[PDB]
Ligand binder design. Structure first.
Ligand SMILES: CN(C)CCOc1ccc(/C(=C(/CCCO)c2ccccc2)c2ccc(O)cc2)cc1
Ligand SMILES: CN(C)CCOc1ccc(/C(=C(/CCCO)c2ccccc2)c2ccc(O)cc2)cc1
Lengths: 224, 224
């Protein structure tokens, strides 16, 4: 039987979300970016709800909740896309109704970025990443997000340790064939940070945030 | 059984390299970058030599050797500065004769970058990073560098496994008090990737490679 943290993360895992592109609009770069914005906004709503079910998270200060989300939001988005794309070949499943191939990535101006995201997909395919590992890694990505402005270092570090421990216990219980599997999972996190870093700077480069700063969006969602 | 890997990493460890900045040139933005360029080039020579001592490295093809180095070189340079800087406060020690504080970083346009490196120093200070840990994470950084051009994926995966095992063996025998210490060390690698990624982008933005691309320098250094 799974440890309570992993099983809790499984029940907290949000339902499928759809991109729902406008069928009346001819495919273009603008259409793709519009659709991705629409998708991401819907996702961010449930990601904030999800974070508040990560044990420890809701009892941190508003400031610390905000810092972790500010630093990790794109990693969580991308990691979901990666998990969704595992049974596919050279394709990114943003949603069940929105799957982007190489050509479509080029048109959207996302080729180099999604190439790196396909690297992640490739690496998780060979490790045969399970859903339990995925939700836990997502939580760890949030907690291990390296914000510069943490107020309660001990609480955040305890949260990291709690989630690391949960991973390690799951691997000890479910993958005795590989005593080093948990560490292999943690070693995938640098490429996640890398691509997320490049995504976030592309995000600001082309001004997809709009007229309202992310900080202001998160504060709205967190105190709703 | 004995594990010789950490021991050979320790004997493979290069000697101190000195900046030797010109004592007749006015302390300025240009002087810093010149000092760092000339130090880094000498550092990279011993790094290539060091990498040749990593078991499995030089049995890779030249293309894969070059590919790991292309992806990792800045992480290796940075982790060295980080380790040299652990007994210092809010200062980065590029060499024994070249230490840079907050004000010198502004002069050189490196503040945002060095604040992130100091963030790494602060994290390692708290865990009490040991030399054995340091050298092994350097080796892991090389092997886990996520190059997109790898030919023999399996051999590179094996090298990662060998080094990961070494760290875990080391942690198990020497830090029984924390059964999760190896994983904590691995969770420091994202911030290093982030930091390097940003430094390499800056590297190219201000065009410090000069008239000879880094891959050409590596080919040259590897053939000597
Ligand atoms: C601020 N709000 C109004 C809009 C939210 O903005 C976003 C717009 C797009 C994205 C996304 C991407 C895809 C990145 C990998 O291909 C992006 C990032 C930067 C520039 C262009 C596109 C995105 C990523 C993952 C998703 O599951 C959904 C959307 C994430 C957020
Ligand atoms: C061909 N050759 C002249 C290339 C020179 O390459 C370098 C020049 C400088 C650097 C270095 C930095 C410091 C980064 C952290 O503070 C840098 C990077 C980008 C832009 C400006 C400075 C550097 C980093 C670590 C070192 O141990 C030595 C030098 C690294 C490489």
């Amino acid at each position: 039987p799974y440890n309570k943290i992993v099983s809790h993360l499984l029940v907290a895992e949000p339902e499928k979300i759809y991109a729902m592109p406008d069928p009346t609009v001819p495919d273009s770069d603008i259409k793709a970016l519009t659709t991705l914005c629409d998708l991401a906004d819907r996702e961010l709503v449930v990601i904030i709800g999800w974070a508040k079910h990560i044990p420890g998270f809701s009892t941190l200060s508003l400031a610390d909740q905000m810092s972790l989300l500010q630093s990790a939001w794109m990693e969580i988005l991308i990691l979901g896309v990666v998990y969704r794309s595992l049974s596919f070949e050279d394709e990114l499943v943003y949603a069940d109704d929105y799957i982007m191939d190489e050509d479509q990535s080029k048109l959207a101006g996302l080729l180099d970025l999604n190439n790196a995201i396909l690297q992640l997909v490739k690496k998780y395919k060979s490790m045969k990443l399970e859903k339990e590992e995925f939700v836990t890694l997502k939580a760890i990505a949030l907690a291990n997000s390296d914000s510069m402005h943490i107020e309660d270092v001990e609480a955040v570090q305890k949260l990291q340790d709690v989630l690391h421990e949960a991973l390690q216990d799951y691997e000890a219980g479910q993958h005795m064939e590989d005593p080093r599997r948990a560490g292999k999972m943690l070693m995938t996190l640098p490429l996640l940070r890398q691509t997320s870093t490049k995504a976030v700077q592309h995000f600001y480069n082309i001004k997809l945030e709009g007229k309202v700063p992310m900080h202001k969006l998160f504060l709205e969602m967190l105190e709703a």
